[PDB]
Design a protein around this ligand. Structure first.
Ligand code: NAD
Ligand code: NAD
Ligand code: NAD
Ligand code: NAD
Lengths: 347, 347, 347, 347
């Protein structure tokens, strides 16, 4: 029982396509056959071998964590999963019975392990998946969609931290999460969705996903752009995808008084904010968004995917049959050339 | 100066197309040219001269309330409106002074009279409109969509009484309003939208509009149909459009525990319910839905219309030029043969 | 080691103070020295050997489940509890592996065993507690307050299904749950709290607790009473503790439009309701209330106990040392002469 | 007809007690006898003639806004008010047909004038008041309380911008708004209320009002102090009253993940915040609080007052008959030596 695996072998940059033994699932574990698997930020940082990577991941370890996989074997004393179950994985392995956790706050909740970071991930033909992190998918759901579901739940928690149907919306940043964010907003009835993005490639993508207006902040004033569209009102809803200090300010200026803000992008530094003018006098409701509601956000994700109202096709810019072009995948990724990237391990 | 009006002349079934003077705008009023005007269930009641109408309306009066109009003249001291403004009207005239209106509850709060019930409506070439009740439309909005924007506030407040993106939803009743409800729900991300409708014409329109599943409750059980779709979980949102006492019971049985019910349809008699099992051990949140949120609800409808996502044309089944066929139009309604029916008075 | 239990020995009405072998904490279980233990309506139904009781309980079974107790021994696989932890039990053994639970609805979830119904209970010097069901108390919290926290959770979920601070409140029914319901209301700033209650013993107790107005719905119309105190506005919040079909109607009439209703009290029969006038046109929000939110509801009850703002002393009308006057307790309860009744087993 | 007024005569520190004519109410206006009026921080900046006041106020003008007053005469066309009516005023003479007010966001409306900022206030024996701005008091509400109802509105909207019963609360700032903040929060069932204040006079007035723990953020770390009381959990509600840049930060570290912050204190300058650690990974909901909800917030303050639960007497520290000592009043206030200060102009 041998398989191919994308492996962090040493401390250096990069990874290796390695042949390894298929793992045996132990108690509370299932082995799945990987049908589709995608690369996020974090896999990219492990690839790059950045400063965070080095203090966290001790090679050799299998990479990846966004899957659509089929259960093939089940470990001792797993009820609830069986062979043939089609699943996706939640990697935030949570508390259970902490303060935040007893209060059902599983997204802002502490501790135990990350899957794909602290143990082997899923860029392999087969992967061990702890049964308590498994999400069952509908059987007719394309594995390539199913595999977006974790980050798509970042975008659902962001888009829908409050109501959006019929709401003028500003999105800053059209990276992978921001593109999924726009997909979620439009399926939720947001109108106009206005996207502020510096990258011309990323705005092509924004416009494709279904954004109603895109503005280039480096090129034209994104606040003035929003006041042109909203005839002076500003946007009801501002969603922060980038982490760029300037785009916080700017969206904070373009939201309407009494409007609502979702903060997902992570900042490089402390930001300097005129609180009085931008939050207290505007009476904003500002939401900090991290992690995923267990399992409310997954129900929503599953079901907007199944509605066909998510325009996901543009976001998946690259699909790769097996793991042979792994290097090229990560490289086009590093170069800002990819929407989402999907490997199909069994072509 | 003269015009035609569809007019309740005597207390009996029917209406007369009559010739009448064009009213002059007093202070705080404006005069509008009626561009499109739509037929309501209250209008059908008045025409038919049922029990409620016989109590409420004193003949003679101009019928109608649902209006897309252009301002031709403006009373003394109207600052906010001018000649040329394309407006729709909120038929509920204000309170500011009542307990319910001081609380911002205009939907529930009562009466300084109603448009087309207590005063002259807008089945007429021109109509008077208090400035306070006027909502300005974007100039590219078809008047036939603008006209529906009142009963679309009703569908908005039913659909968005709570969150709906990604939520399985049961709609009972696909009359005009229920159809409006399916189209909002689909624009707001509901999935599946399951429709329960005994009329086959009405089921075909639900399907055209965008319902994911239609069921006839006279032909099979609408609850087991729900439970087959939601794997025995039930629907998370149940919207009551019919006012059939049996629909209420079946939807309440069909809602998931923790689920959400909005009630719009008005019942014919008091309804006998199993409180304990259908509402209390299910821990349901149940809202009665009446009127419109002045004006939050109108910003949402306006912008759902401009968004392109409301599938309204399959709902608009009958368009008339002028009023000469008004009898054919009410009688087609009565007979359950219409979606929404639009008069264009100036062709 | 020998203990006293209150035991349901046969079929028959009544119970038996027997002598028994202290049990053996097994896997996932702890054993606790019982400090305070209270009787609820289900203990009364097991004792009256009603119809529900015979189909549910196979004797002999130890009775009770409202407990304040100390861990004196810990079984295999326990980890989160240890000797000396002062705890209360949550009897609804839920399961984070259902649709309702995966959605964090532990109050309307499918249940395993109930503790005190399907297995032995707490009317006894020591008791097996499953350790997943245990809630730890601050150690200076009195055992007889702590005994009350399950039913104070019903009352919290009911009082606080919505905001209540500054809010006119109608409570119908001042049995124990409505007494606790009043205590919570007054600690949460509800004002005036009006209580409708036919028993004068119970209305006396409702004033002691802190109700601002009590009315006898038998001597006087409770609706016109509310319209009096609220100058015709109606109450803003109506909480249903009785389960009297007629109180449902009357509180539905006395609540203001836009008002909020919590349904707790269980009904003898289907109730016939005018939905149009009472629910739809008043635009009510109505909450079916059952069970308790794990573990939000416990946090608030604990904290509200610790505040000393719960006027709970008037509710606890009978305290008994050990189990010897046990028959008198049940009879006083059966005859409606108690608020809550608390045993101290080690006294 | 003559009276006295505390009047901003020239652009400099201070004010003159001057004799002026008694105003005549025109249409839409009411003339009141002023029974009690408190001093606001805004009036303090008009008095000092700080920077803000230099920009906005145009002397000569009567200062003051927080009023309890008795109608003595009604202008042409006032129907809801008559002589003898006991009223309080909302000094936000609101925006009109604007976006924020059309959504019902009156608290954050960007108009129209302000009472005793842009037109004569109420530090006089008589004052003209727009009828639409008038709130009716219960005849038995003492005037010193009715007069604190506007800044009690600030405190209510801040305390109760989400749920608070049973919620561990940190209040930073026990100045006049903060003291009302603590009194509202206790009447709401908040527990514990932990107060952070440098002034010792103020920490004692905090404790008198009903704070459960006070800390000096200059003697010991308030974060650490919050961590010991809440067993390391943090506070569940963080309410910012001071506008101290250091307090904003310490609050945000103090709040539990999933916690709620309400920001009301105005900052002296832009603030530098770790967004990633303090709002985003902690998944806070942050509400900027400004103005008052017209008129829910007034219903709420009225009824909490009338309820006896607001511990208002220790807050009112200085009570003055006529305006003769109006410089002692303002000077004690600057010095930080008052809770709230009331003038009784007709002593
Ligand atoms: N909140 C959390 O705990 C959490 C969880 C997951 C991801 N994230 C964050 O969201 C992620 C977004 O992921 P991604 O895949 O979209 O990263 P990304 O680099 O691919 O996208 C974010 C950026 O937005 C654009 N941008 C940069 N400056 C801008 C500006 N000044 N105005 C407008 N747009 C600007 C950039 O071109 C880039 O697209 C990262 O920001 C990460 O910081 C946060
Ligand atoms: N609640 C409010 O304040 C408010 C305001 C306006 C209108 N309404 C109500 O909602 C409105 C809907 O109006 P419309 O224009 O959609 O009405 P409609 O009368 O034309 O049709 C609704 C019905 O649904 C179907 N139906 C009948 N029995 C059914 C059953 N047992 N199960 C499922 N479906 C069934 C019928 O074919 C019919 O179409 C009316 O009921 C109006 O009374 C309520
Ligand atoms: N919702 C759930 O799943 C759930 C959970 C726990 C308890 N409960 C229910 O609520 C419980 C209350 O328990 P208790 O211990 O307070 O019950 P209880 O029988 O001891 O008291 C309720 C009764 O309310 C009063 N009442 C009767 N008719 C009335 C009327 N017409 N108007 C006003 N009051 C009237 C009676 O005097 C009596 O006080 C019971 O009603 C039980 O039915 C429901
Ligand atoms: N948000 C709105 O739109 C709005 C409207 C009006 C007033 N306000 C604000 O709330 C008010 C606060 O209440 P006030 O009227 O009592 O003013 P206040 O100055 O008396 O209280 C603020 C300060 O709190 C204390 N403080 C200072 N530094 C602190 C620190 N580092 N940590 C903890 N506490 C500290 C000081 O003793 C002083 O009381 C003012 O800040 C005003 O700016 C806001």
């Amino acid at each position: 029982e041998k398989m191919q695996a994308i492996m962090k072998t040493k401390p250096a940059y990069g990874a290796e396509l390695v042949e390894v033994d298929v793992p045996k699932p132990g108690p509370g574990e299932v082995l799945i056959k990987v049908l589709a698997t995608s690369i996020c930020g974090t896999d990219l940082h492990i690839y790059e071998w950045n400063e965070w990577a080095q203090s966290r991941i001790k090679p050799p370890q299998i990479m990846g964590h966004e899957v659509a996989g089929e259960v093939v074997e089940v470990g001792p004393g797993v009820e609830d999963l069986q062979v043939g179950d089609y699943i996706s994985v939640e990697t935030h392995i949570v508390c259970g019975k902490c303060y935040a956790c007893k209060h059902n706050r599983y997204h802002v909740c502490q501790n135990t392990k990350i899957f794909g970071v602290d143990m082997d991930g899923v860029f392999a033909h087969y992967a061990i998946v702890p049964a308590k992190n498994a999400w069952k998918n509908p059987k007719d759901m394309p594995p390539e969609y199913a595999a977006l579901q974790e980050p798509l739940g970042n975008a659902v928690d962001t888009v829908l931290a409050g109501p959006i149907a019929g709401r003028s919306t500003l999105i800053t940043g059209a990276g992978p999460l921001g593109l999924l964010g726009i997909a979620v907003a439009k399926a939720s009835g947001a109108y106009p969705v206005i996207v502020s993005e510096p990258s011309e490639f990323r705005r092509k993508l924004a416009k494709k996903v279904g954004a109603d207006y895109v503005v280039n902040p480096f090129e034209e004033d994104p606040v003035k752009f929003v006041m042109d569209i909203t005839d002076g009102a500003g946007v009801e809803v501002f969603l922060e995808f980038s982490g760029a200090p300037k785009a916080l300010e700017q969206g904070l200026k373009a939201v309407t008084p009494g409007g609502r803000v979702s903060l997902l992008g992570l900042f490089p530094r402390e930001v300097t904010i005129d609180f009085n003018n931008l939050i207290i006098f505007k009476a904003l409701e500002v939401h900090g968004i991290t992690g995923r509601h267990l399992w409310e956000t997954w129900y929503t994700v599953s079901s907007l995917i199944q509605s066909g109202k998510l325009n996901l096709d543009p976001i998946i810019t690259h699909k790769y049959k097996g793991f042979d072009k792994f290097e090229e995948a990560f490289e086009l990724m590093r170069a800002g050339k990819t929407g989402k990237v999907v490997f199909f391990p069994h072509k």
